[PDB]
A paper describes a structure:
CK2 is a heterotetrameric enzyme comprised of two catalytic subunits (CK2α) and a central dimer of regulatory subunits (CK2β). Amongst these kinases, [name] possess a single CK2α orthologue, [name], which is orthologous to both the [name] and Cka2 catalytic α-subunits found in S. cerevisiae. Furthermore, it was reported that disruption of [name] severely perturbs the production of two major virulence factors (melanin and capsule) and attenuates the pathogenicity of [name]. The structures present a classic fold that is a characteristic feature of protein kinases, composing of an N-terminal region filled with several β-sheets and a critical αC helix, as well as a C-terminal region that consists primarily of α-helices.
To gain an insight into the binding affinity between cnCka1 and CX-4945 for the development of selective anti-fungal drugs, the near full-length structure of cnCka1 in complex with CX-4945 (excluding residues 1–4 and residues 334–338 which are not visible in the electron density map) was subsequently solved and refined to 2.09 Å. Similar to the AMPPNP-Mg2+ bound structure, CX-4945 binds at the hydrophobic catalytic cleft and interacts with the residues mostly through hydrophobic interactions. Additionally, hydrogen bonds are formed between Lys67 and CX-4945, as well as the backbones of Val115 and Asp174 with CX-4945, and an electrostatic interaction is formed between the backbone of Arg46 with the chloride atom of CX-4945. In general, due to the ring structures of the CX-4945 molecule, the inhibitor bound complex contains more hydrophobic interactions as compared to the AMPPNP-Mg2+ bound structure. Our results indicate that CX-4945 binds to cnCka1 at a binding affinity about twelve times lower than hsCK2α. In contrast, CX-4945 IC50 for cnCka1 was 77.44 µM, indicating that CX-4945 IC50 for hsCK2α was ~60,000-fold lower than that for cnCka1. However, in the cnCka1-CX-4945 structure, the corresponding residue His159 does not interact with CX-4945 as it adopts a position where it flips away from the inhibitor. On the other hand, in the human structure, Arg47 does not contribute to any protein-inhibitor interaction, while in cnCka1-CX-4945, the backbone of Arg46 interacts with the chlorine atom of the drug through an electrostatic interaction. In contrast, in the cnCka1-CX-4945 structure, the hydrophobic interaction between the corresponding Thr112 residue and the inhibitor is weaker due to the lack of ring structure in the residue. However, in the current study, we have observed that unlike hsCK2α, cnCka1 has a small residue (Thr112) at the “gatekeeper residue” position.
Residue numbers in the entry: 5 to 333
The structure:
């Protein structure tokens, strides 16, 4: 049915040794070369600890993984190996496991993040352009390697504001794109879920990540976190519909032959498109420009095939100051 409009054939060209994570053989490192110092975070899927690589006395992260499905371990490790050297992708340092339990751990680089709720309001207009551009380099890189992140959100984007460095982290939901594959629609955080996930459209692609980027960008320039605040998955679609409008939703549904679940009959009304300018306020207007609105408009589309590619997104006039400043060094 639907096929990605860029990078559709990447996994075809690279072959089984790139994407066949089921047959991954890990060359496990020495667990005793690492010392766990302090827990920094817990996920649904993991626990993250500040650690030391003892031989070099260097600071690093140990991410202990306990998913009920083992192939999710292999998938995360294969993608992290494949993205080696990628710009702004979190660096894999090692993979180790407990000798008795066989519980695996991923070792990554440590990043001194400032939490996004503190960090995002301190950004200038230029900072938003700059960090979105850096995030675009990581998404263009993984898409060009046949990989969808599927969990793009502020929590998975680590920024060292002092060093002006960015890392896209937590590749645990990431997956290889294979033309015509039916993917699980139970991916991403509710506020960052694309319409395709909300209406059970399974033939999605890299363009899912561009919707999620659009939700992050909206929250940064309008200072509303999260931008689409649904109380549940059905409500998430209503919140989107109350901004993009029900007219563009219905042609999209017709275009991809999607039938809405009967649950939407009572809760989904007819809404006109709310123009982007209505979200402009005294507090957020320092982020706002016609280039910014134009950029956001071209990310937040129902139709995944209408959204900018990460590569098109880097060519947008919004990033002209960032491209100019980079050209000065
Ligand atoms: O998943 C990864 O690849 C992943 C990779 C690197 C980090 C991480 C998650 N989580 C961090 N912190 C964090 C903060 C709150 C909750 C959770 Cl679970 C974790 C963190 C901190 C400093 N440097 C690197 C990381």
């Amino acid at each position: 049915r639907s096929v990605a409009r860029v990078y559709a054939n990447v996994n075809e060209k690279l072959g089984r040794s790139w994407w066949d994570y089921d047959n991954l053989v890990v060359q496990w490192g020495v667990q005793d070369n690492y010392e766990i110092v302090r827990k920094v975070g817990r996920g649904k899927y993991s626990e993250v600890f500040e650690s030391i690589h003892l031989p070099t006395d260097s600071k690093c992260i140990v991410k202990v993984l306990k998913p009920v499905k083992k192939k999710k371990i292999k998938r995360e490790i294969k993608i992290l190996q494949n993205l080696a050297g990628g710009p702004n992708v979190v660096g894999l340092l090692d993979v180790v496991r407990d000798s008795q339990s066989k519980t695996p751990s991923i070792v990554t680089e440590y990043v001194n993040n400032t939490e996004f709720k503190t960090l995002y309001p301190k950004f200038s207009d230029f900072d938003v352009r700059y960090y979105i551009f850096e995030l675009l380099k990581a998404l263009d890189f993984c898409h060009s390697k046949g990989i969808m992140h599927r969990d793009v959100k502020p929590h998975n984007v680590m920024i060292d504001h002092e060093k002006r460095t960015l890392r896209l982290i937590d590749w645990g939901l990431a997956e290889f794109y294979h033309p015509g594959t039916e993917y699980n629609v139970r991916v991403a955080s509710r506020y960052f879920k694309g319409p395709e996930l909300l209406v059970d459209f399974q033939e999605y692609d890299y363009s899912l990540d561009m919707w999620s980027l659009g939700c992050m960008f909206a929250s940064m320039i309008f200072r509303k976190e999260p931008f689409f605040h649904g109380h549940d998955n059905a409500d998430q679609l209503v919140k989107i519909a109350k901004v993009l409008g029900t007219d563009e939703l219905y042609t999209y549904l017709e275009r991809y032959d999607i039938d809405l679940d009967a649950q939407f009959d009572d809760i989904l009304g007819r809404y006109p498109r709310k123009p982007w300018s209505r979200f402009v306020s005294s507090e957020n207007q320092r982020y706002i420009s016609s280039e910014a609105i134009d950029f956001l408009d071209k990310l937040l589309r129902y139709d995944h095939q209408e959204r900018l590619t990460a590569e098109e997104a880097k060519e947008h006039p919004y990033f002209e100051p960032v491209r100019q400043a980079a050209a000065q060094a």
